[PDB]
Amino acid sequence: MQKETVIIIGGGPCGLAAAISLQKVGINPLVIEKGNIVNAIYNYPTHQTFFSSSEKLEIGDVAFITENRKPVRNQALAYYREVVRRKSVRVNAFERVEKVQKDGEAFQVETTKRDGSKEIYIAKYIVVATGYYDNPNYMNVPGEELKKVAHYFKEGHPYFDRDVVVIGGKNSSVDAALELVKSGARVTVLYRGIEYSPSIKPWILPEFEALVRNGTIQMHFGAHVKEITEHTLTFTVDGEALTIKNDFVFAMTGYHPDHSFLTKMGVQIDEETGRPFYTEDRMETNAENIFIAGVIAAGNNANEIFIENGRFHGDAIAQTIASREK
Amino acid sequence: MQKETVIIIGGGPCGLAAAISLQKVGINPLVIEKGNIVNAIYNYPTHQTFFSSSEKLEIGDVAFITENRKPVRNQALAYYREVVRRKSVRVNAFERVEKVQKDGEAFQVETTKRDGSKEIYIAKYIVVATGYYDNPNYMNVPGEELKKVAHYFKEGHPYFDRDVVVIGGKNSSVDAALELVKSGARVTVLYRGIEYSPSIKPWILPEFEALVRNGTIQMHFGAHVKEITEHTLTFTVDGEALTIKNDFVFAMTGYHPDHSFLTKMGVQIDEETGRPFYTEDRMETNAENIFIAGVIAAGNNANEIFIENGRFHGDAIAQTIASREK
Amino acid sequence: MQKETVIIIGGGPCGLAAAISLQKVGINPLVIEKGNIVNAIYNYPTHQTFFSSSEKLEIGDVAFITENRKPVRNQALAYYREVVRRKSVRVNAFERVEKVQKDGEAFQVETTKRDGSKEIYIAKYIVVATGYYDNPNYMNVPGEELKKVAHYFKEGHPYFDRDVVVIGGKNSSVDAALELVKSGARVTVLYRGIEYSPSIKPWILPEFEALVRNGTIQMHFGAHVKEITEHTLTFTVDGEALTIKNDFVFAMTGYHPDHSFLTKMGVQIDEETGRPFYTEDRMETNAENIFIAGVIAAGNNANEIFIENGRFHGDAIAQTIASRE
Amino acid sequence: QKETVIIIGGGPCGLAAAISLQKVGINPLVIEKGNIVNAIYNYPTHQTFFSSSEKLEIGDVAFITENRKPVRNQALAYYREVVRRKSVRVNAFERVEKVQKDGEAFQVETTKRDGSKEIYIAKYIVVATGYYDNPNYMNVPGEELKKVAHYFKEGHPYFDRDVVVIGGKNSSVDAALELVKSGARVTVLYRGIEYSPSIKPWILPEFEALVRNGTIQMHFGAHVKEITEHTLTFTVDGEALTIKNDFVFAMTGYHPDHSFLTKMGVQIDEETGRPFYTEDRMETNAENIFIAGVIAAGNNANEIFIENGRFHGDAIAQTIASRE
Ligand SMILES: Cc1cc2nc3c(=O)[nH]c(=O)nc-3n(C[C@H](O)[C@H](O)[C@H](O)COP(=O)(O)OP(=O)(O)OC[C@H]3O[C@@H](n4cnc5c(N)ncnc54)[C@H](O)[C@@H]3O)c2cc1C
Ligand SMILES: Cc1cc2nc3c(=O)[nH]c(=O)nc-3n(C[C@H](O)[C@H](O)[C@H](O)COP(=O)(O)OP(=O)(O)OC[C@H]3O[C@@H](n4cnc5c(N)ncnc54)[C@H](O)[C@@H]3O)c2cc1C
C-alpha cells in the first residue's frame, strides 16, 4: 500500500493551509478530499458574500486582493485554486476517507475512490481537517425527508411566487430569507429563539428587521416545527400549533462535526464543552500523532473557529511533526 | 375539468411573450411550466453572458435596463420575474404537461403536478412553447450513461486539476472549454467537423484559437468518440483510434425539440430538418388550433430562432386566436 | 423667441418626473438643463451605491429592475437615459437658465448655451427643479480655496498613502472615509456634531464605527476647522487647537439651493434654512405660476426630500397647471 | 538627495522595475507626477483589460480574478496592494523636470505638489514615462475648443448628442461603442482606407456590426479639416463634407516625450519614434540611462504592453547589480 509521511483528511481552507505549513518545513503531505478543493465554499449559495475581508482568508502568503471590501464565493474559489496551483499542494480529489486505524507506529487509512474502488495508505501522522458542513442538524420531524425540504441554500430564483419557510435564526437563515424576498417568494421565518439572534451581522440586521416589522417577512419567534407535508407546515409557539400553507422549506438549522469519525480513531471528546481533546500549541489530539485543523476543533459553539483563525492550526502541526522528523 | 381559452406549454421567454401578446387581445391565458419561469435560463452556466443586447430580450414593453452592454444570466432571471409580476401573467409552475388530445372542438391537456397528482384541463387553443434545452443530442456511445458524462455545463470549479473532454463544436462547447481552462482543468476538445463552425460567435473564437495555438487546449478535428470508461476515452480520427486518460466528459453536442411530444399531438415534422409544419403568419401548425412559439419552431442545427425573433411569435398567434374568438 | 407652455429648469430625476407628469395631462414641456440629464448623479462618486431600492427611483412607470438589492450610479445613469428616450422628454441640454422675469401673464426666460450665445423663451409656467448639488456649503476658513480642498468626492485611488481629512457627518462623509480607507489613505474625520447623524445608513455605520474603535480612522466629534495649509490642517475641539499633517481635504459639508436664482425671479426664501415658500398641495411658490420640484423644496439641509418622494411633486404641479390650462 | 537609481514614472512597468531592483539589493526611488498607476487611473471608467490578470502581475504578487479579464478598478486595487506589500518607495505628486549628467552621476530636477523644487543626484536613471500623457495632436483649426477631447472617460453626458470619434485605434473603437451604448449619435472618421489591423479581433465584430446596420456612420480615408462649435468638416476623396457636431473625441493615439529623452542624451532615430537601446540591458545610447515599459516602443506602439514591459526591470536590475 502507498506510504505517506502525513495524510491530511479534507481539502478545505484549513487543510490546505496545513499542507503548505508542512511544505515550509520540508514535508510534502497528501491531502485526501472527497470532492474537489474547498468543497464547502463550492457548496455556498451561488452569490454568497463572505463576512471576512479577503486578507483574512489568505493562506500560504498568497495575496487575495479584491476591489470590493468583502469577497464573494466565486472570488474565493478562484483564489484557492490559484493557491493550490502555485504551491503544488498534493490533492487526491474525489476520494473519501472511510477509516483510520493504528498499525504499529503508523496508521492505515482506507478510502473509496470516485469509481467505487477501495484504496489503503500507510501514514506516520494524520491531520483531520474535515469541517462540519457535511452534517446538518436534522430536526427529526415528519416530512423533513420530502424533496421540498433542504438543509442548504443555493439560489432564490426558482422560488418565485412560492410559499417558502426558512427555519433558523442565524446568518444563514437571514441571508436565505433576504435572497428569497428579492426573488419574489413569500417568506416565513421560524426560529426557536425568542428574539433576534445576537449573531446576525450588524450590517444585515437592519434590512431584515425592517422587513419583519412591516410584515413582509412573516416571523415566528419561539417556534418549534412539528410537521411538514407537501402543501403545509405545522409549528408550535408556547405549545399552541399553527398550520400554514407551504411549498418549500429551507431548514437552516446549522451543522455539527462528525465526532464518531474522531472517536473511532482514538480521539476523545470533552463533554460539556463539545471539543475534541487537544493541546493548542501542537494542535495534537489525545491520540498520539493524530492532529486536527480547522472547525473540526470547535466545541458546542460551532462559530468559535472559522477561516481567519483556523488557517493557523497547521503552523503548530508542522512545527511538531518537523521536530519529530519522519 | 378546469376550462381555459388558451393554454401555453412552457414559460420560457417566448411562451411568456405569447401570454402577454394574448393579453393585448383580451385573453389572459394559462402558462403551464414544469419548473419555474425561464427554467432554461436558470439552468444556463453560472457565468453565462448573453450574446444579445438587453433590449432584444425585452417582452411586454417592460424595460430591461443594463449598464453593461450585454446582460448576464442573473440579470435576465431578475428581468423575467419582474415581467411576470408586472404583467400579471398566469403561471402554473412545477407542473409538467404530459398529453394533449383533441376531444371535440377543444383539447384535453393532462398534467402532473409537483406532488405527483394529475390534473386535466380543457382548452380551446394550444401554444407549444417548449424549446429544446431539455433534450440533448445523445452521442450513442458506450459509456455515455456514466455519471462522469454530462450533456450540460454549469460551473468549472470542481474540475480543477482534472482531465476533461468537451465534445462538440457549438458555441456551448467552446464556452465550456474556456471556462474549464479558467478553472484549471486539463481540457481536450473533440469535434467531428474539420474546421471551426462558422456559428461560433466571432468575438469568442479568438480566445479559443489562441489556447489551441499555444498548446493549452488539445484540439482534435474529425474526431469521433467510440467509448467512454471511468478513466479513459477512445476516439478515432481518419479511422485511427486513440485512447486518452479522462476523468469527466462534457458532451456539448447541442439539443433538439421534443418531436415525440409534437407528433403525439398531431403535428407533422420534416424528417431532414427537424422543423414542424406551420404557417408563419399564424404560427399555427398543421393541427388546427395548435400553435408554436419560440425556438421549438426551428429546424436543422438551429441558429435561426432565438429570443430576439422568437419573442414575436405570440403576436401572430394572438391575432389569429382573436379573429376566431370575436 | 421660443414659446412654451411650461419650462422646467433642471433635468435631474425630479425635473424629469415633472415633465412626464405634465405629459400625462397633455402638455409636453421643455426641460432646460445646464449639463446633460441627471448631471447630479453623473457627478456622484464613481462607485456610489444608492440607499433606495431601484423601484423607488422609477419614474414614468419605466421599470428599473436590478439583480442586486440597491442600484449603483452607473445603473441609474442608464435608467434615466432610457426613461428620457422612451418617454420622448424634450431636453435642451448644455443650456444654463440665467434669469426668469415676469412679462405680462407669462415669463421671459434667458439662458446661456454651450457656445456662449444667449437665448430667450416665453413660458406660461415655470418649474424650478435645480436641486442643490451645485452649491456647496462653504466653510469660509483660510486655505479652503487651495486646490488640495474639494467639496465633492469622486474616487479614492489617488489618495493612496496620503494623509486625508474628511469634514462632515452625513452619509457622504462616511462613504468617502470608507472608500479612502479601502484605497490606502490615512483618514481623519472631523465633524462639528457630537454624535453620529441619524441619517447615516444603518447598514454602513457599523463598519465605520468598527474602524474608529480599532484606530484605523481618527474621528473627532465637536471639531471646528480653523485653518488649512498645503501640508497641515488646524482644528479645535472644546476650544483646544490641534494641528495635524494633511495632504488633501474633502469638505463634505453638504449643499444648498441657488438662492440668488430664486429670489431674483420673485420667490421668497427663508434666510436661515434656505427653503422656498410654497403650498404643498400645488407645489407653487409665493410667486404665481412658479412651481418647484425636487430637493430644492427642502433647503440648506434637505434630507426630508429625496427621489423617493420628490418624484411625485410633478403630479401636484401637473394637476394645477392642467386645470389652469 | 542621493539615491543609486531613480525611476521616472510609477506605472506598472516602473513599479516592476523597482521590485526587480529590490531583488538585487537596491531599494530605488520612484518619482511619479500623480499617484501610482496614474495612467490606469485615467483609463475610461468602463475599461476592461485585453490581458488576463496573470499577465499583469508584478513582483510575484498574485492577481486573482473570478472573471477572465480584469477591469480598471481591479488593477488599481492590485497595484496599490503591490506597492504596500513590497514597500516600494514612491515620491508621489512630483514631476521630474530635467535629467542632466553631473560627473559620473545625474542631476534630476523636480517640481512638487506645492510648487517647490527639488534636486536629487542618482547614479542610474530608468525612464518609464509611457506615452499616455502626450496625445497625437491633429493640428487642425478648432482642436483647441473645449468640445474636443483627446481622452475618453465616460459616455453618459453625450446622451442624445452628435459626437465624432477620430482615429483607428482600439481606443477609438472602444469610445465609439461606449458612446453608442450611452445614446450618442456617433460618426467615426479614420484616415485609413479600411478597418485598422490593430483592432482586437474580439472587438472589431461588434463595431463592424453597428456600421453595417447603420447605427455608426463610418468614413474611411477621412481627413478632418475644421471643427466649429456646431459643425465639423472633413474631406473624403476630394469632396469636403460638413456635418452637425456637438463633441469630438480625437482618439489618435499617443507618443513618448521625445524632448525629455533627447535633452538627457537619448537618441530617437527619425522615422520610428523608438529610443535607441540594447534589449539585453534595456540601456539607451546614453550610459546608465535605461528605459522600461511602453516608452521603448516605436511607430508600432502596440509592440510593448504590460505583459512584456513588466520584465524590462529584470534586464535593468541585472545590469545595475553587475556595475555595483
Ligand atoms: C455561507 C457561509 C459563509 C461563510 N463566510 C465565512 C467568512 O466570511 N469567513 C470565515 O472565516 N468563514 C466563513 N464561513 C465558514 C467557513 O466556511 C468555514 O470556517 C471553513 O469552511 C472551515 O474550513 P475547514 O478547512 O476547517 O473545513 P471545510 O472547509 O468544511 O473543509 C472540510 C473538507 O473536508 C472534506 N471531507 C469531509 N469528510 C471527508 C472524508 N471522510 N474524506 C475526505 N474528505 C472529507 C469536505 O469535503 C471539505 O472540503 C462561512 C460559511 C458559510 C456556510
Ligand atoms: C448558454 C446559452 C446562452 C444563450 N444566449 C442567448 C442570447 O444571448 N440571446 C438569445 O436570444 N438566446 C440565447 N440563448 C438561447 C435561448 O436560451 C433560447 O433562444 C430561448 O430559451 C428560447 O426560448 P423559448 O421560450 O422558446 O424556450 P425555453 O427558454 O427553452 O423555454 C421552454 C420551457 O418549456 C418548459 N417545458 C418543456 N417541456 C414542458 C412540458 N412538458 N410541460 C411544461 N413545461 C415544459 C421548460 O421547462 C422551459 O422553461 C442562449 C442559450 C444558451 C444555452
Ligand SMILES: Cc1cc2nc3c(=O)[nH]c(=O)nc-3n(C[C@H](O)[C@H](O)[C@H](O)COP(=O)(O)OP(=O)(O)OC[C@H]3O[C@@H](n4cnc5c(N)ncnc54)[C@H](O)[C@@H]3O)c2cc1C
Ligand atoms: C452620493 C449620493 C447618494 C444618494 N443616494 C440617494 C438614494 O439612494 N436615494 C435617493 O432618493 N436619493 C439619493 N441621493 C439624493 C439624490 O441625488 C437627490 O435626491 C436627487 O438628485 C434630487 O433630484 P432633483 O431633480 O431635485 O435635483 P438634481 O438631481 O440635483 O437635479 C438638478 C438639476 O438642475 C440642473 N441645474 C441647476 N441649475 C441650473 C440652471 N441654472 N439651468 C439649468 N439647469 C440647472 C443641474 O445641472 C441638475 O442636473 C443621493 C445623493 C448623493 C450625493
Ligand SMILES: Cc1cc2nc3c(=O)[nH]c(=O)nc-3n(C[C@H](O)[C@H](O)[C@H](O)COP(=O)(O)OP(=O)(O)OC[C@H]3O[C@@H](n4cnc5c(N)ncnc54)[C@H](O)[C@@H]3O)c2cc1C
Ligand atoms: C484603455 C486602455 C486599455 C489597455 N489595456 C491593456 C491590457 O489589457 N493589457 C496591457 O498589457 N496593456 C493595456 N493597455 C496599455 C497599458 O496602459 C500600458 O501598456 C501600460 O500603462 C504601460 O505601463 P508603463 O509603466 O510602461 O507606462 P504608464 O502606465 O503610462 O506609466 C507612465 C507613468 O509615468 C508618469 N510620468 C510621466 N511623465 C512623468 C514625469 N515627467 N515625472 C514623473 N512621472 C511622470 C505618468 O504619470 C505615468 O503614471 C491599455 C491602455 C489603455 C489606454
Ligand code: NA
Ligand atoms: Na430554529
Ligand code: NA
Ligand atoms: Na462532435
Ligand code: NA
Ligand atoms: Na462638520
Ligand code: NA
Ligand atoms: Na484618423
